[PDB]
Amino acid sequence: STGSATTTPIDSLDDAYITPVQIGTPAQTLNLDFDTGSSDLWVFSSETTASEVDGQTIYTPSKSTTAKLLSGATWSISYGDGSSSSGDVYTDTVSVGGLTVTGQAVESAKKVSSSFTEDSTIDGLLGLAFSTLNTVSPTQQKTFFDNAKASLDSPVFTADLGYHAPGTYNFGFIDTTAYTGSITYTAVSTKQGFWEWTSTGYAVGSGTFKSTSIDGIADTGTTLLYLPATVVSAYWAQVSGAKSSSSVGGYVFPCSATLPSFTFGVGSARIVIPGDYIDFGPISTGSSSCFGGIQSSAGIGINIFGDVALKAAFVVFNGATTPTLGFASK
């Protein structure tokens, strides 16, 4: 089997991407944030505290004839910012782009933090990291990809995120028309539960490539590119007027600037992020100070190849017995 679904930016800045997912019988379609940095499939639901729902579509398990309460199971997640959610668990039928999993754990939110309530366009998350990170207790549950894997034509999924445009998540096959040149594969460590890999270095604009190992995670659920302070400083030094602002919480730059590209290494291959991918617009409405899309990872503890990086590539998440990651230009 295979699946193919379109993923769509939630706003004009590509802050996140939503992908429609069918849950239950009859289908209830929710727009989920596919997140390769986490491993829970959780949704706003009929059980979510009413005051914490503001526009989201909800999953109502009582209306699904294939929903079964997973007795005693709870979940609770705290993501890397300050956001959180928690609740109970059903198993149900879940389909993505024509690919169907029966008995998928669907984690129903009873509580969500304000940041999620404020995201009217995001009905929940679909985790695509390794199942070792799944938070369900007392019996950990598998991700959608792990459940589907054995049935797929090939044990892979791909992310093809658009810049200011829709893109695609494919399961079970490589669309050879979706990229240029070849796919360069690189080793993954699953020790922290992430799609963790090591970039071979970087260039800023037309500058010379710096060979240096940068360990980080491929994370579709993070908006920006978080890299070591030395690398980030080198990038922003090429933008006149750019500075790190403690009050704003990162590098900002004059909205009148032309941003240079940023290149990252994948083995001997090179992925080029165009300068305009690095613009996240005015820090507040009407401001002429703009927020940068490349930021320091120093306060995080890990480097993160988020959407800013990933949307410059066609990315293969290879779930073979020894997983690997593939990157192609497009």
Ligand X SMILES: CN(Cc1ccccc1)Cc1cc(C[C@H]2CNCC[C@H]2CC(=O)Nc2nccs2)no1
Nearer to ligand X by Cβ, of 9 and 172: the residue is: 9
Stretch that binds ligand X, among 114-122, 154-162, 185-193, 230-238 (CB under 6 A): 114-122
Residues contacting residue 329 through CB under 8 Å, at least 6 positions apart: 179, 180, 181, 269, 271, 272, 312, 313, 314
Question: How far apart, in whole angstroms, are the C-alpha atoms of residue 193 and residue 23?
Answer: 26
Closest approach of Cβ 186 to ligand X, in Å?
A: 26
Residue tagged 């710096």 (tokens): 210
Asked if 35 is an active-site residue, the reply is yes
Nearer to ligand X by Cβ, of 170 and 223: the residue is: 223
Q: Tokens in use for 131?
A: 């199942």
50, 51, 71, 81: residue in contact with ligand X (rule CB under 6 A): 81
130, 235, 280, 305: residue in contact with ligand X (rule CB under 6 A): 280
H/E element, 197: strand 196-204
Closest approach of Cβ 198 to ligand X, in Å?
A: 25
Report the largest interatomic distance among the alpha carbons of the chain, rounded to a whole angstrom.
60
Q: Does 223 bind ligand X (CB under 6 A)?
A: yes
Q: Does 83 bind ligand X (CB under 6 A)?
A: yes
Closest approach of Cβ 114 to ligand X, in Å?
A: 9
Q: Tokens in use for 189?
A: 């460590």
* Distances from the Cα of 143 to the Cα of 22, 25, 149, angstroms: 15, 20, 10
35, 47, 107, 119: residue in contact with ligand X (rule CB under 6 A): 119
* Distances from the Cα of 263 to the Cα of 240, 250, 315, angstroms: 19, 20, 15
Question: How far apart, in whole angstroms, are the C-alpha atoms of residue 207 and residue 73?
Answer: 53
Q: Does 144 bind ligand X (CB under 6 A)?
A: no
Q: Does 115 bind ligand X (CB under 6 A)?
A: yes
**Residue 144 phi, psi dihedral angles, 5° rounding:** -55, -45
* Distances from the Cα of 106 to the Cα of 7, 60, 66, 157, angstroms: 20, 11, 12, 20
Q: Does 116 bind ligand X (CB under 6 A)?
A: yes
Asked if 287 is an active-site residue, the reply is no
Q: Does 34 bind ligand X (CB under 6 A)?
A: no
291, 305, 317, 327: residue in contact with ligand X (rule CB under 6 A): 291
Residue type, 40: D
Closest approach of Cβ 122 to ligand X, in Å?
A: 7
User: Is residue 82 exposed (0-12), middle (13-18) or buried (19+ Cβ within 10 Å)?
Assistant: exposed
Q: Does 15 bind ligand X (CB under 6 A)?
A: yes
Question: How far apart, in whole angstroms, are the C-alpha atoms of residue 175 and residue 183?
Answer: 11
Nearer to ligand X by Cβ, of 203 and 278: the residue is: 278
Q: Does 283 bind ligand X (CB under 6 A)?
A: yes
Nearer to ligand X by Cβ, of 208 and 247: the residue is: 247
Instruction: Please pick, among 38, 86, 108, 199, the residue that the annotation labels catalytic.
Output: 199
Instruction: Please pick, among 14, 33, 35, 92, the residue that the annotation labels catalytic.
Output: 35
List active site positions: 35, 199
What does the binding site for ligand X look like in residue numbers (CB under 6 A)? 15, 81, 83, 115-116, 118-119, 223-224, 280, 283, 291
